[PDB]
Structures are given as structure tokens and as C-alpha cells.
Design a protein around this ligand. Structure first.
Ligand SMILES: Nc1ncnc2c1ncn2[C@@H]1O[C@H](CSCC[C@H](N)C(=O)O)[C@@H](O)[C@H]1O
Lengths: 265, 265
């Protein structure tokens, strides 16, 4: 009687690890949530066919409010798996669910999978140079989130890159595009005047990481803000000072303006 | 005409993704490098058996000096796979290899897999709170590198966690232990006296991430410096101020002392 937290990866059903698949295939009950991220290259049906089990999808409320009443009860007398997009413990609050598991006397194990947090390495930007991360949240009513702007400022001041997770409204089927994120950032800039994000700021966009042909683009906000980066999910990155090799990759692979090759050391 | 960069994941031969395995199986030639890191929970033989292909292992020199003479020629007229521990392109030197492919008229695609960079999510520490990362290198002769100490200092003063990759002598398969890293840091502290790493510093050790039975331990240096965390690899994290939820996970899951709930939050 145990509970497995198993990541499904970045884009499609084949992004699950072999370990995760073999373990999922032998579980008695399989649950999953698809509100923390978007797997744009698969369907519930394909995932179900791969693991050979029926998958009960849980809503954010089911998990946050009733994980211990829906999943844990079964884990006390059966092998249960809880599937999630990407890595189950990255940019989610699922780690806390392991405490609930302990309290219920249920042992839990974690099976990792490709995460967008590390996949950004495909942009050519050195992973160790990424600083604090942030999420660009949709404004709601009179509330306009701006914390992410300060994160960029803090990292950039230290010469570090900033990974910006983009908002998602699973129920409404709304996925924030890199374009919308840029528009919001420009609005915060006009409000704060920190000189952190402007039309001349160099940015990198990574869309549908995990697919064989993800969209990887780098350039100035003024040029990319109205560019079509394809279907979601998208992630936006605001690089700090570039090493020469980072600039070379952005130019050669992400189509960045050749002028960025001339770094100001 | 195609080169696939395929990640092998965290620990053993089943940490490769289903996508990576199926693609590797269909490749005409398969190369691999084990110098950026190692796969401690498996062997080349077990990886070969899973993929059902002979694996040509390449040294750091083979890759950095002769990638275009060893791998690319075959990729020109065949489907070739290049396996790497973890997630491809996390290691800083990997990215440039895609430019080499482009220069040789070879298409390249990246197949992601779990990376320790994202797997640390299992420590319960929020991924967004991780700042710049660093590597603790073994001092040698008259060379005593200490830049990693400064990374911790700069992250911590901003309330961010610091991921410290530990040194490895790839060919000899000798891993720096978290204990050795702590000893080194106390030594650097005694030299810099910045009050960044002392007996009272709270640290988190993650050993054998990817395994079903990783060791996750949190506590003060004075208590953990001589503790046995099991077989390698080891990762050391120096967290910044903790969110109560992070602290509760460290206490409940990582055996941290209750004291952290009042001292480090
Ligand atoms: N394949 C992908 N391509 C681009 N962005 C992605 C992505 N998968 C996730 N994201 C980004 O991350 C956000 C979800 S955050 C949850 C992340 C997940 N646990 C993981 O490990 O990846 C999305 O709204 C999007 O901005």
C-alpha cells in the first residue's frame, strides 16, 4: 500500500520516464491532475492507452481540499499513482501532499520527469546563470500582480537570467502567451519606470518544449511582441548579461539579431 | 541526416524517457558521454541491454576536440543518438554541439529527461526560490577555488536557496561527498569570515535523486557533517530563509530538527 507521485513530462505521453511507466502499469489505481501545466502533444486517451489503466482526473479543488479523502484512502490498501505534467514537485504545491500522505500512514515515492525548469537549457543560456524564478499572473479585477517585475530587476542586477512561468487557467482553457506576458511587463515598466523591461530588452521565448520541434526565439521585445510563437504552452526568459557562447547559440539557433554577438563586457 | 541529443536522466537505466528509449532503439549509431556526470545506479552494459544497441563512449576530448569527426560524419547519412546523463544541454558545454551540427549540415533534436536541477524539488524547497547555482570543486595543489562561497552569500542575502553540484572525477568515478563539501565550506568560511557557512548553518543533502530510495536530510552543519548519507551522488543545498511550508516538509520528510521552524523561517 503506497502512493507514487509520477511526472508525465513536458509535451506528450512519451515524456514519462521508463521507470514511471513500468511502475504506473502495475498500480491498482491511477489518478492525475492536469491543471498545473499543459501537455500540448497528447490526450488523456493516449496516456491511458500507454499505461493501460483508467485515469481518474482530479480538479484543483479535489486535490487541494480532498486529496486525503479521494486518493489516500485507497493508498492504504492498494498501490496508487498520482500523475502530473512535467515534474510533480516543480512549480507546484504538490510537495505538501507528501506530508498528508505521511499523516495518513501512507509511504510515498517520487518519480521525476523532464521539467520546463531544466528544459530551458535548450535556449542555449547557461542553466547555472538562472536566478530566482517568477510567474506572470493574469490581472484580476482591480488587482494587478507585479512581483515578477521585481524578480527580473533583482536577477538582471546580478547578471542572472530570469525564467518566467506564464499563467494558466485550466478550467477556462486559458494559457498565457509570451506575447501577453510581454504586454503586461511593458505596462508594469510604465508604472514603475525601473528601466527593467522595455522595447529594447532582449528576451527569449520557448514554446512547446518537449516536442521535437519546439519554437525557440530570441530578439528585442519591440520585434517579438507581435510574433506568432505557435500553440501554448509558452515560457518567457529575460536574459542577464550574456557570455559569448550564449549569444552565439541565440543567433545560430534561436534566430537572434547578429548584433547581440557583440557583448558589452 | 539527424542527430538526437538524448538525456538518460538521474540515476539508472530506466530514467531515460520512453520517447528517448524508442528513438535510441531506431538509431543506426549510438554514442554517449559520461564526463559531464555519471549514472551511479546502472552500468554501460545495462544501458546497452535496454537500448539493444552497442554504445560508443566518448571522452571529454573526443567531444570537445573531435565531435565533428567522430559523431557528425555518421549523422550525415544515418540517424545517430548522443546520450548524456541527466537532461541534455544543462551541462554548459552541450549547447555549442548543436551549432557544430548546424555547421555540418546535420539536423539535431533534443529529447529531455530529468535533471538534478529540477529534481531538487523533492527536498520540499520551492523551485522558484533557487538562485544562481555553483559547483564545489576539490582543491588541488596550490589551487583552492572559492567562488561557490560567494554564490551562496549573494543568494542567501536575497533569501534564495543555493544548489551546489559536487565535484566528480569522471574517469576514476570518485564522487565528492556532502560531508567533504561541508568540510571545504567551513574551511573557506575560516578564510573569508563572511559568516556565510558555519556550524549553525542549515543545509539540505539529497543523495541518489532518481532512485526510489534517495536520502533526503536536513539539519545544521555541526550535526550533519559526519553523518552517513549513503552512496553517491550527493548534492548539497544551502537554503535561504524558509517559507513555513518548506520548513514543515523538511521536518516531516527530511528529518530536520523542530528548531528550524523557529530559527530558519
Ligand atoms: N513544454 C512546455 N513548454 C513551454 N513552457 C512550458 C512547458 N511546460 C510547462 N511550461 C511552462 O510552465 C508553466 C506550468 S508551471 C508547472 C511546471 C511543471 N511541474 C514542470 O515540471 O514543467 C506553464 O504555464 C508554462 O509557462
Amino acid at each position: 500500500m503506497v502512493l507514487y507521485f509520477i511526472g508525465l513530462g513536458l509535451y506528450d505521453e512519451r515524456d514519462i520516464t521508463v521507470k514511471g511507466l513500468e511502475i504506473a502499469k502495475k498500480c491498482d489505481y491511477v489518478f492525475a491532475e492536469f491543471y498545473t501545466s499543459l501537455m500540448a502533444g497528447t490526450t488523456l486517451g493516449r496516456i491511458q492507452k500507454l499505461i493501460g489503466k483508467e485515469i481518474r482526473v482530479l480538479s484543483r479543488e479535489d486535490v487541494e481540499l480532498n486529496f486525503e479523502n479521494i486518493v489516500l484512502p485507497l493508498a492504504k490498501e492498494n498501490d496508487v499513482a498520482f500523475l502530473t505534467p512535467g515534474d510533480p514537485l516543480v512549480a507546484t504545491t504538490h510537495a505538501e501532499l507528501r506530508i498528508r500522505a505521511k499523516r495518513a500512514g501512507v509511504e510515498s515515492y517520487v518519480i521525476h520527469a523532464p521539467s520546463i525548469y531544466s528544459a530551458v537549457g535548450i535556449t542555449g543560456l547557461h542553466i547555472y546563470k538562472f536566478g530566482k524564478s517568477a510567474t506572470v499572473a493574469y490581472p484580476e479585477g482591480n488587482w494587478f500582480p507585479t512581483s515578477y517585475y521585481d524578480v527580473i530587476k533583482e536577477n538582471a542586477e546580478r547578471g542572472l537570467h530570469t525564467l518566467l512561468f506564464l499563467d494558466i487557467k485550466a478550467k477556462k482553457r486559458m494559457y498565457m502567451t509570451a506575447n501577453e506576458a510581454m504586454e503586461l511587463l511593458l505596462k508594469v515598466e510604465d508604472m514603475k519606470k525601473g528601466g527593467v523591461f522595455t522595447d529594447d530588452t532582449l528576451v527569449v521565448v520557448l514554446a512547446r518544449a518537449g516536442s521535437l520541434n519546439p519554437t525557440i526565439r530570441a530578439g528585442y521585445v519591440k520585434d517579438l511582441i507581435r510574433e506568432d510563437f505557435g500553440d501554448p504552452p509558452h515560457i518567457l526568459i529575460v536574459p542577464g548579461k550574456l557570455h559569448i557562447v550564449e549569444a552565439e547559440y541565440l543567433v545560430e539557433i534561436a534566430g537572434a539579431p547578429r548584433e547581440i554577438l557583440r557583448v558589452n563586457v
